[PDB]
Design a protein around this ligand. Structure first.
Ligand SMILES: [Ca+2]
Length: 213
């Protein structure tokens, strides 16, 4: 696994992170990941872009850690994109492609309503832990700090240092990579709203911190 770190996103660290490029996840992810869709701003931010190179085709950005991370506090200072039919995320993930069980822990912002955040996690591919929380502000407007404390017997999620949600049942056990992506869905209209093709759209990440357990 990796040790504690802080990245201020003043520049793109290619020994530490890697960009998805040249393929689509398939199913609900109605886009092709492109390296060019992950970029660094002159303000010290990582920006993920949803862009359209041709009619009804969408390019998106996903960035992942090279190392894998285990128990402890994950914090992201970010602001999601705002639009029907999209998600901006910050999550941990390992699964069958990595020779392990599907273990994942999510903070997801459904673009159809950026005044709510969704929490979730999967343990050995079993999911359905969705919890939707009212933020009391519009996440798309300004940076906020979002976090999860992943322990052996519980996950605790925070918004600006305040506890919002706690899970205790069927908790993930396999270290995963730290990931962020922004994408437009198809086939999941009830969850995300339909996507209406509007672009470009951006999600911005000021910084990421992990603190080992
Ligand atoms: Ca920064």
């Amino acid at each position: 696994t990796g040790g504690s770190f802080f990245d201020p996103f003043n520049g793109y660290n290619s020994g530490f992170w890697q960009k998805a490029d040249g393929y689509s996840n398939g199913n609900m992810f109605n886009c092709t990941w492109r390296a060019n869709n992950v970029s660094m701003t002159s303000l010290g931010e990582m920006r993920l872009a949803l862009t359209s190179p041709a009619y009804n085709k969408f390019d998106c950005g996903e960035n992942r850690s090279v190392q894998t991370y285990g128990y402890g506090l994950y914090e992201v200072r970010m602001k999601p994109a705002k639009n029907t039919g999209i998600v901006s995320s910050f999550f941990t993930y390992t699964g069958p492609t990595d020779g392990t069980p599907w273990d994942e822990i999510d903070i997801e912002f459904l673009g159809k309503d950026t005044t709510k955040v969704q929490f979730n996690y999967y343990t050995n591919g079993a999911g359905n832990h969705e919890k939707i929380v009212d933020l009391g502000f519009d996440a798309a407007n300004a940076y906020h700090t979002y976090a999860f404390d992943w322990q052996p017997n519980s996950i605790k999620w925070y918004v600006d240092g305040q506890l919002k949600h706690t899970a205790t049942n069927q908790i993930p056990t396999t270290p995963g990579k730290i990931m962020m992506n922004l994408w437009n869905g198809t086939g999941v209209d009830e969850w995300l709203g339909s996507y209406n093709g509007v672009n470009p759209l951006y999600a911005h990440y000021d910084w990421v911190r992990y603190t080992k357990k």
